Design a protein around this ligand. Structure first.
Ligand SMILES: Nc1nc2c(ncn2[C@@H]2O[C@H](COP(=O)(O)OP(=O)(O)O)[C@@H](O)[C@H]2O)c(=O)[nH]1
Ligand SMILES: Nc1nc2c(ncn2[C@@H]2O[C@H](COP(=O)(O)OP(=O)(O)O)[C@@H](O)[C@H]2O)c(=O)[nH]1
Length: 401
């Protein structure tokens, strides 16, 4: 079922590698017999920059996974950087392949680990194809246009999720559209989809006789979303079940916004809001990046703040940083906070780059990864946040030799 395209400037060796393909499906090719993997290929044959652009465009729309190819003998070229600069506009997985041949500043292209390959005898192909196949189980069951922002609202039953969605969808800036498990709409003319509103529209038809299926349904909604709105009940406060879904959204690397509903019903004061906020921070210690919003679906108070926060969390989730700035910020962290020694060896940081988006992920090339301690990693994380923002999203840092 899965579809794969190969993209790159001309003369990097795409034809040799492509020619992994068996027989044409009458365009689309099936994978050859020797491959222990099951997928289809899409051809992209059919001034210099605009004719490269056509290929990448088609690949981005149809392919589930994209192999980005460069030439090892040339190194990274501006032409490669341009193809890179197009491929940034997709949320579909890209895997980088270095042909003809060392593997240092291909990380600069910003797609992570470069997989070296030769086409004469197919050296490196196993590793490449394993890397591509790993993405197959994360392919969207339901497919939307690239522009659409997908988010979910999850929480415990009777926290007012349905009320919130109806309160949100009844605003002047919103236009509701017209696979009716999801709700489509625009807000300030941007397209959005709320994942799994069917499970939210379930009651009235069905008695929910146990939470265990609701929770598993919510985990699946999360898998499909870029932003997760975790809704807490203002009246009752945080109980133990709240933590599970939220931890899952965090571990899955999704953008998160915390929403406290039913704020109309708490006995307010300036102190009451700040106490509830710090209580969230104590119970949800892994969601420090997540903004907290107080609103009432009932009386419509501060409902207008929800969509701007989803947009912003979504923007930061997809943010791609410049390498020179990134390395300046990390060297500024090392200068303000000298690295801890380890018996007799000090951590040295050579170079940093971004390896992916959604969530933002960074690789730091070091001496030895073991000397990079959890606490110092957290320190780098915080320094990265102060320089770039990143509100609403987790970020990942990995040290590599
Ligand atoms: N030495 C070496 N040369 C290669 C390899 N793969 C491709 N080439 C050469 O690079 C050239 C570029 O291939 P090309 O047919 O332009 O593929 P395109 O990317 O679809 O244009 C080919 O003529 C190959 O001879 C390789 O693994 N090793
Ligand atoms: N006091 C108060 N009650 C609310 C608010 N929002 C929803 N409710 C009530 O909470 C109950 C559960 O609402 P529902 O939308 O079914 O929550 P869901 O289980 O998350 O879908 C309903 O009876 C609503 O009347 C609010 O902002 N304030």
């Amino acid at each position: 079922k899965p579809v794969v395209a190969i993209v790159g400037r001309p003369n990097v060796g795409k034809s040799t590698i492509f020619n992994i393909a068996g027989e044409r499906i009458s365009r689309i090719y099936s994978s050859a017999e020797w491959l222990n993997y099951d997928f289809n290929l899409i051809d992209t044959g059919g001034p210099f920059l605009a004719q490269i652009r056509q290929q990448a465009e088609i690949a981005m729309d149809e392919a589930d996974v994209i192999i980005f190819m460069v030439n090892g003998r040339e190194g990274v070229t501006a032409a490669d950087e341009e193809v890179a600069k197009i491929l940034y506009r997709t949320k579909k997985p890209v895997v980088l392949a270095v042909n003809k041949l060392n593997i240092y500043d291909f990380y600069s292209l910003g797609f992570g680990e470069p997989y070296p390959i030769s086409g004469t005898h197919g050296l490196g192909l196993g590793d490449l194809l394993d890397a591509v196949a790993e993405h197959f189980k994360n392919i969207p069951e339901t497919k939307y246009n690239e522009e659409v922002i997908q988010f979910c609202l999850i929480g415990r039953p009777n926290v007012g999720k349905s009320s919130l969605v109806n309160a949100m969808l009844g605003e002047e800036r919103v236009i509701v559209s017209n696979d009716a498990v999801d709700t489509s709409f625009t807000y300030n003319q941007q397209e959005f989809v709320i994942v799994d509103t069917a499970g939210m529209r379930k009651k009235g038809k069905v008695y929910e006789t146990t939470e265990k299926y609701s929770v598993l349904r919510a985990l699946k909604a999360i898998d499909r979303s870029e932003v997760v709105a975790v809704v807490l009940d203002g009246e009752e406060g945080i109980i133990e079940q709240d933590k599970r879904i939220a931890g899952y959204a965090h571990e899955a690397g999704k953008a998160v916004v915390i929403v406290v509903n039913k704020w109309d019903a708490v006995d307010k004061d300036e102190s009451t809001m700040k106490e509830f906020e710090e209580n969230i921070r104590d119970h949800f210690q892994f969601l420090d990046y997540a903004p907290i919003l107080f609103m009432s679906a009932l009386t419509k108070k501060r409902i207008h703040t929800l969509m701007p926060a989803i947009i912003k969390a979504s923007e930061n989730h997809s943010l791609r940083v410049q390498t020179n700035v990134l390395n300046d910020v990390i060297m500024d962290a090392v200068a303000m906070n000298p690295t801890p020694t380890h018996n007799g060896s000090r951590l040295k940081i050579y170079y940093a780059t971004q390896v992916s988006v959604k969530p933002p992920s960074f690789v730091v090339f070091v001496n030895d990864p073991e000397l990079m301690h959890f606490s110092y990693e957290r320190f780098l994380e915080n320094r990265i946040r102060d320089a770039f923002g990143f509100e609403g999203t987790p970020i990942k840092i990995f040290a590599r030799a």
